[PDB]
């Protein structure tokens, strides 16, 4: 019975582990977990926690590029919040449409 119920905990504890490793890799670049995940979705980059945590360990130069992208998209959001719509959208804030 423990082995049958442990298949829900394994999946849960994995995602908890990934998030802890992403949080740690984002603080090295002066970012917080919500600002990385939330702003990578705004750049249409659909990378899950498992892959992100693997990149922070084995591809550090790629994870800093992803953090700089999230920080760039985050700063464009603030700039747009100061304007009233007149200023155009940012370069990395554009959205590719699929019909």
């Amino acid at each position: 019975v423990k082995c049958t119920k442990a298949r829900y905990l394994k999946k849960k504890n994995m995602r908890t582990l990934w998030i802890n490793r992403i949080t740690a890799a984002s603080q090295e670049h002066g970012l917080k977990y919500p600002a990385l995940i939330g702003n990578l979705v705004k750049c249409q980059v659909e990378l899950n926690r498992k892959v992100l945590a693997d990149l922070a360990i084995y591809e550090p130069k790629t994870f800093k590029s992803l953090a700089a992208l999230a920080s760039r998209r985050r700063h464009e959001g603030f700039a747009a919040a100061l304007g009233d719509g007149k200023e155009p959208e940012g370069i990395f804030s554009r959205v590719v449409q699929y019909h």
């Binding site: 670049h29 922070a56 360990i57 084995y58 130069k61 800093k64």
Partner: protein, 150 residues
């Protein structure tokens, strides 16, 4: 169970599929009975199915020993040396055709818990993370509150 059983890491036999694919199934030994209701499905597999199965798999040597027996079995031997014995007792032809084909597809490695669903010998390409990966260097490599030229 995992704690009550052994485990292994995902692997292959002689880096199979890297340069070429080599079928690991090396030998098949059937033991059917001329008489016996248990072997009815095995006899019909030897009349129409086994001959066409050997044409497709020329690297597998198939032995059919018809002798008195109450439980017919098929023994599969693989290149790595593993031997898997299975029973075709009171099984239809369709059930024995999917089983034999399963044996041909397998590698011989023990069917036990696999720790990771992936394996790579070169996991990193930019450098495995270490504490000093994202740390900046200081002038003259000094340490916190270290008097230089004292």
């Amino acid at each position: 169970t995992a704690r009550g059983t052994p485990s292994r890491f995902l692997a292959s036999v002689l880096h199979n599929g890297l340069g070429r694919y080599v079928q690991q199934l090396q030998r098949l030994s059937f033991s059917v009975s001329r008489d016996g209701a248990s072997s009815r499905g095995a006899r019909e597999f030897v009349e129409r199915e086994v001959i066409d199965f050997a044409r497709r798999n020329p690297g597998v040597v198939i032995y059919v020993n018809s002798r008195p027996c109450c439980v017919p079995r098929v023994v599969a031997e693989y290149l790595n040396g593993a031997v898997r014995e299975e029973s075709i007792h009171c099984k239809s032809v369709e059930e024995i055709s999917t089983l034999v084909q399963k044996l041909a597809d397998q590698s011989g490695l023990d069917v036990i818990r696999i720790r990771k669903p992936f394996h790579t010998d070169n996991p990193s390409i930019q450098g495995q993370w270490h504490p000093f990966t994202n740390k900046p260097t200081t002038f003259r490599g000094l340490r916190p509150r270290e008097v230089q030229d004292p």
